[PDB]
Each structure stands twice: as C-alpha cells, then as structure tokens.
C-alpha cells in the first residue's frame, strides 16, 4: 500500500504525474528512488518518485 504524499509533476512524456492522496501500485521498491507504479483505475503505467510517496 503506497500513498502519493506530494504531487509528482515531472517534465517528460514518459513518467506519469499524480496528485496528493492518489494511491499507486508500487512495482519495484527498496532499490532505486524512482519506482515503477501502475494505476488500477485506468490500468496504465506511471513511474513515481520515492520522495513523493510513502508506505501507509
């Protein structure tokens, strides 16, 4: 269970952006600050930084 604390608004068309309060499915953690998250709503990819999310 990972919650997006701060909204992530990168400046690239690859990593997706999210808002605060949106849950994200962490795919790979305890490895690189940037993990690959997947949304269960639209069912798409979305790389989210680690300093913007935290286990709840």
């Amino acid at each position: 269970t990972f919650v997006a604390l701060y909204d992530y608004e990168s400046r690239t068309e690859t990593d997706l952006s999210f808002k605060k309060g949106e849950r994200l499915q962490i795919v790979n953690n305890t490895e690189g600050d940037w993990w690959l998250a997947h949304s269960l709503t639209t069912g798409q990819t979305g790389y989210i930084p680690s300093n913007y999310v935290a286990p709840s």
């Binding site: 990168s10 600050d33 300093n51």
Partner: peptide, 9 residues
C-alpha cells in the same frame, strides 16, 4: 535522475 524538487519551501 535527481529526485523531484520539494514543493515551495
């Protein structure tokens, strides 16, 4: 890939 800058601070 530096981490994203913190919000206004």
């Amino acid at each position: 890939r530096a981490l994203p800058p913190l919000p206004r601070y």
